Design a protein around this ligand. Structure first.
Ligand SMILES: Cc1cc2nc3c(=O)[nH]c(=O)nc-3n(C[C@H](O)[C@H](O)[C@H](O)COP(=O)(O)OP(=O)(O)OC[C@H]3O[C@@H](n4cnc5c(N)ncnc54)[C@H](O)[C@@H]3O)c2cc1C
Ligand SMILES: Cc1cc2nc3c(=O)[nH]c(=O)nc-3n(C[C@H](O)[C@H](O)[C@H](O)COP(=O)(O)OP(=O)(O)OC[C@H]3O[C@@H](n4cnc5c(N)ncnc54)[C@H](O)[C@@H]3O)c2cc1C
Ligand SMILES: O=S([O-])[O-]
Ligand SMILES: O=S([O-])[O-]
Ligand SMILES: O=S([O-])[O-]
Lengths: 485, 484
């Protein structure tokens, strides 16, 4: 018989959630987790991308930037605070790493209490029902299991140019960087790029963002553009329609000096500039190519690296499942991986028939001005239902907290997208402003219940809170009405 | 015919909202607003309780307290900030009044643009379809209208004891107080009492709360008790089951020194202590007794002062309507008054048949730890549906922002209340934590759509944000499971 009921390959958000849930049904479970180091040698503990080099440290550094702004705001509220307050990168990073270390330990303890075997080893299939585990010393051991769950996540992509691995960093290195990045170039335009750029500027750095085409491809573009305009007003420089072709080291150091050469995407024009740090945020690649899928028959999308799965998270191979960021056509989010993992365990071992619902899943981008959304972008809604059947209600708003400091009127923005063919069903929700994620969450539940504009209008606001703007939206884009407060 | 289509008595949240909406239908409208001064002389501009002496300044002073805590938190996030930061009451109050002054102006401008007549005069009915308006010099003018809207709001209550009007203040005076209150006694246990106590402590004052019976009567009591415990851990002192019997002035000043004597509610025990400022937050009374209702036949509840109305906001007198805090059995909230006013204007003049919906209206209490809720308290749900038919799911949580400063784990708290006889319909929602109102608003919209537990569980969380706790609540009170 098999060594385990279930072996899980990857101890991140999805893998750990599935492992804890499967162990409630008295199953024998092993989790394999290993962190291959970045090209410059960075590694970390158990818990995956989110805990170590993703959501958690990112939000903490965003909070540090927010706190910088709160120091300024406090003066008009009467706090007698000295004029210049400087920021200490090492102190910040030490507190972030301390918290991450406690999570690393929490997860190890938790697996032990649930009687899940944890092996700090890299897993690679070698034949049906069999996997090889290789630890940090190169010792190999072979294990078998009745079922397997692939939850290996992704890792940052490089550009394939001279000097990129040698001199640049990615998000994987940023969050434990042992020196202040200094003058920084962020290459890319994903949410990670913009978030990182945002918090680095918010702690006082000179930041530049180099963008291949557009910001936040896949997100509502009018929202994306407002985010960018706000970043630019707060001193972040944008270089539009360029990609780096090489990175050269002018001087080593911590940080050193780097010369970046870059080429226009739509012409032959070339540019050069120098930076202390270059952060590459040009996508992520799925960890699906070096895990012996070919020895067990698992098919993947050879071009993207993603794994297609059934609506129960089964690969083409019936005893092998997959969840999380490696899935094709799903979403790269922690709570999605967590829900997929828990529900999977419940279907396999608890008799449940409930499937993970990947529709209308909310997100938030933690740019200096935060952006929460759920459902369709305006352009997707127009594509799906037709322009004549879509009504968009919108407004600017001004958080009360920002009045006394006297800043940033008419930046925060709210809209809902309604389908006129279906009782003005709210098919998209978008907010730009503080605590955007806190705002969005409950409206995402309301979308699950079929919220219509009429229901939304009958809902009473809470005063004085930003979110209440959603209960009185009466001006449509189609009307051409003015929406400046 | 009449001088006006509609005369509105009271230029506060409800009255202004109704006036702006009625003017969209090309009606001739007047708003009467007058602010009778507090016993110590405080007065203010157009806009009502909320703008001048309620929601707006209260949330701004709450924000000042929050910023104090942010100063502390900033150190662990790497900001090299000096050890002691002091707070300046006058600077805070000056900025708050400056903002209120821009709102006073905004509402006058907005009436004028809508062609609504604004008269700074106190209104008192004198006969059918007729009202007398008295200005600050005592000049009287008579106006008529086809319909009237009463929206006069409420004012703070005193205790009826020696020294109370002479030496104490209320919320009406607090927000423009020209000096720092110093050592403060807050008398009462309403949301106003606790919010004011909370921000005063948050800006560094020595604060004591004197409570007659319980905290936040009318609200979920387990939530109320957690709020109080949190206040107490942060240095707010509570005096339990006492009421003041007199206030005596030891020394005049700004602030002075006051001696408060108080009596136990359930014994003969007596106590004394001294304070710089005494803030009374012991309820509010409806401005319904000095407006000539008897000359037009409008019936009120003589005991409470509140006005019963139909579901269309009509009093017993068919050309006279009422909205806002004075209504019997409704809710004392700005957005409720605003909605009621707008929808009333639309029914009277726009052919709408839509009524204000007073069910599952959310609220937030802006105590140091904020409390948002919507729907039923646990004890009201149990009364209404029966204990065996109620499931409560709950959990503590720890905002990520609080980890690095390393404080206050297992304080923030979330629960939903479900009706097992109706598909686990979520009939109550409760959250204790930061940004509680931002969290509660969308869940209130979900309650309007009939949210069930299954739908809530199928909703995916946003990570890492406090509100996501609501999407994974699996532990019930009934199960006895541990939730730390
Ligand atoms: C900068 C950044 C910010 C983000 N912010 C957010 C956010 O705000 N909110 C949000 O919801 N999501 C966010 N995400 C995404 C979130 O991190 C991922 O959605 C989530 O971690 C994916 O979980 P997972 O289980 O699929 O993979 P991971 O958590 O990446 O776990 C994969 C684990 O498997 C390990 N592994 C890989 N191959 C092997 C092998 N062969 N054997 C053993 N172990 C292996 C990996 O090292 C890792 O430990 C962010 C991501 C990044 C990079
Ligand atoms: C300290 C405090 C905090 C509060 N916080 C909140 C909160 O966070 N959120 C919230 O939603 N609500 C809050 N409220 C309540 C909110 O302020 C009221 O619900 C709301 O203002 C009621 O609006 P209204 O139109 O009923 O009356 P008001 O705005 O009180 O308006 C009544 C107006 O009529 C004037 N007036 C009275 N009699 C006459 C007369 N005879 N003739 C002419 N004018 C007259 C009054 O002076 C006043 O201008 C708070 C209240 C207080 C006291
Ligand atoms: O601005 S120079 O140090 O890269
Ligand atoms: O291979 S999955 O698309 O059935
Ligand atoms: O106003 S009643 O006396 O007709």
């Amino acid at each position: 018989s098999y060594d385990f009921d279930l072996i899980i390959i990857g101890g991140g958000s999805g893998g750990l959630a599935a492992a804890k849930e499967a162990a409630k049904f008295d199953k024998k479970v092993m989790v394999l987790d290993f962190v291959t180091p970045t090209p410059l040698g960075t590694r970390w503990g158990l818990g995956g991308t989110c805990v170590n080099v993703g959501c958690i440290p990112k939000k903490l550094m965003h909070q540090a930037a927010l706190l910088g702004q709160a120091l300024k705001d406090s003066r008009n509220y009467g706090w007698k605070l000295e004029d210049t307050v400087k920021h200490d990168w090492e102190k910040m990073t030490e507190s972030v790493q301390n918290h991450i270390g406690s999570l690393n330990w929490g997860y190890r303890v938790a697996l032990r209490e649930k009687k899940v075997v944890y092996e700090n080893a890299y897993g690679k299939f070698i034949g049906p029902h069999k996997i090889m585990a290789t630890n940090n010393k190169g010792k190999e051991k072979v294990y078998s299991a009745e079922r397997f769950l692939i939850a290996t996540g992704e890792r940052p992509r490089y550009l394939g140019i001279p000097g990129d691995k040698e001199y640049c960093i990615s998000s994987d290195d940023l969050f434990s960087l042992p020196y202040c990045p200094g003058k920084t170039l962020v290459v890319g335009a994903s949410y990670v790029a913009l978030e990182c750029a945002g918090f680095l500027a918010g702690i006082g750095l000179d930041v530049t963002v180099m963008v291949r085409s557009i910001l936040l491809r896949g997100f509502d573009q009018d929202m994306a553009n407002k985010i960018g305009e706000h970043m630019e007003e707060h001193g972040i420089k944008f270089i539009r329609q360029f990609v780096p072709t090489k990175i050269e080291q002018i001087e080593a150091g911590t940080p050193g000096r780097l010369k970046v050469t870059a080429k226009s995407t739509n012409s032959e024009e070339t540019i050069e500039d120098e930076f202390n740090t270059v952060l590459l945020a040009v996508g992520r690649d799925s960890c699906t190519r070096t895990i012996g899928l070919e020895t067990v028959g698992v098919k993947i999308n050879e071009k993207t690296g993603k794994i297609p799965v059934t609506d129960e998270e089964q690969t083409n191979v019936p005893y092998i499942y997959a969840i999380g960021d490696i899935l094709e056509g799903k979403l790269e989010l922690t709570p999605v991986a967590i829900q997929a993992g828990r529900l999977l365990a419940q279907r396999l071992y608890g008799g449940s028939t409930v499937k993970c619902d990947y529709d209308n899943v909310p997100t938030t981008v933690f740019t200096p001005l935060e952006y929460g959304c759920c459902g369709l972008s305006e352009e997707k809604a127009v594509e799906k239902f037709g322009e004549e059947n879509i009504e968009v209600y919108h407004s600017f708003f001004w958080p009360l907290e920002w009045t006394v400091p006297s800043r940033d009127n008419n930046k925060c923005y709210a809209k809902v997208i309604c389908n006129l063919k279906d009782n003005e069903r709210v098919v998209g929700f978008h907010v730009l402003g503080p605590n955007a994620g806190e705002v969005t969450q409950g409206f995402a539940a309301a979308l699950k219940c079929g919220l219509t504009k009429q229901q939304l209008d009958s809902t009473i606001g809470i005063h004085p809170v930003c979110a209440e703007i959603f209960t009185t939206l009466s001006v449509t884009k189609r009307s051409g009405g003015d929406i400046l407060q």
